Paper text:
Several clusters of these genes showed sequence similarity with the chaperone/usher (CU) pathway, which is conserved in Gram negative bacteria and involved in the assembly of extracellular fimbriae. One of these clusters, encoded by the cupB operon, is unique as it contains a non-chaperone-usher gene product, CupB5, which is related to the TpsA-like substrates of two-partner secretion (TPS) systems. The CupB4 chaperone was shown to be associated with the tip adhesin CupB6, which is larger than classical adhesive tip subunits and displays only limited sequence identity with other CU subunits. In this paper we describe the crystal structure of the tip adhesin CupB6.
The crystals belong to C2 space group and the asymmetric unit consists of eight molecules composed from two up-down-up-down tetramers. The molecular mass of CupB6dscB1 in solution was determined to be 39.5 kDa, which is consistent with a monomer. Each molecule consists of two domains comprising a putative tip adhesin (residues; 1–202) and the pilin domain (202–343). The pilin domain conforms to the classical Ig-like fold of other chaperone-usher pilin domains with a C-terminal β strand (strand G), provided by the NTE of CupB1 located at the C-terminus. Five alternating residues comprising glycine or large hydrophobic residues from the self-complementing G strand (G351, V353, F355, G357 and I359) are positioned to interact with the five pockets of the subunit groove. The adhesin domain of CupB6 is 205 amino acid residues in length and is significantly larger than typical adhesion domains of the chaperone-usher family, which are usually between 150 and 180 residues. One unique feature in the CupB6 structure is a surface-exposed polyproline helix (199PPPPPIP205) at the C-terminus of the adhesion domain. Adjacent to this is a shorter sequence (17LPWR19) that also adopts PPII helical secondary structure despite containing only one central proline. Adjacent to the PPII helix in CupB6 is a shallow pocket delineated by hydrophobic residues V21, L25, F36 and I204, which further suggests a role in receptor binding. The lack of a convincing binding pocket at the tip of the CupB6 adhesin domain would suggest it recognizes its receptor using an alternative surface.
Numbering used by the authors: 3 to 363
Write the structure that this text describes.
Amino acid sequence: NEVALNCSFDNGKGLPWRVVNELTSGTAKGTVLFARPVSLFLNYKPQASQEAHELVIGGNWSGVGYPGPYGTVASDVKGIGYRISVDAQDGVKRVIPVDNQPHALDKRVTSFSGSTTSDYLQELVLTVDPGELPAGDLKVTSVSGSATLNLWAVDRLKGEASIGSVLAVPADNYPTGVCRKPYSLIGPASIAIGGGPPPPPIPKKCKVEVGREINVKLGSVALKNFPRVNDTSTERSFDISLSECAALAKPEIAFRDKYVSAQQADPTILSLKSGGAAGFGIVVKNGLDQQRIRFDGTPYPMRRVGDSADLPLSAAYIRIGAEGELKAGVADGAAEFTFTFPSDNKVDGIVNFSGNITELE
């Protein structure tokens, strides 16, 4: 129970962040995504005293007037909040509060050894619904704003200051060098306290096998089956799917005509490879929105089911020519599709349509 002088806080062995809970569309507000246990060395020089002394460890957040959802201070990443608490010797978890004054969260019996530890729990909390979360990785590097984390090691007469109360910091400087000044952490430093790695990012992508080909057989149809322009063959159903998707992945898919580069007068009509049938095209219908796909590069959202994302599709021949224009033959078309997470620029696959326009039934 000696007097503490010249306090300083120093980093211990730094732990990696751990996943308390998995982020999911099902994750509730207030859930703890990540947590880390931090241990700091508290060093001071003892000097003998007649009266018993205590080292009172205090904390408070300054630079913001009031706390955020779930006792958090806003993180640089929106919808994710930072909360830090001390694992007190009395066996109580106490969160450092947002207040103008520091609060007494722990005490340490003073000793000549001049060495002790301060123990904390770091927590990253979801303050919004997962859908509400921003696009991108979501890595947390810093607290938002000017908010600063203050740790106070303060020497006091044993038992004079109550735990859980505002921590009074004496006006006096004796004995010269008494422990009174704060340790203030700003921005990434508050997040990076105690050393160790930065929080991990959240994955937002599905697994894409590049060069994937899909073949759809439209079959053979006689010209007599398309009496009027805008008439179509029987629909063929197919699905374009992605698997091993991250919980919060929301990918999109875009299509281009393999044979046409310029913007089409009507991009709902996919072109046939030339030297075959004439006056016909292919139409593909989006199962979700119920509208025909445009093959100009418009991106389409995909449905999410379990770990996979898919777009349900159906395809058919459509008659575009007037009476003179129709010709029979091989009817083949191709659509290149790209996925954006958004993270794709290269073509990621092709859909091949094959079939025939025949004269005789």
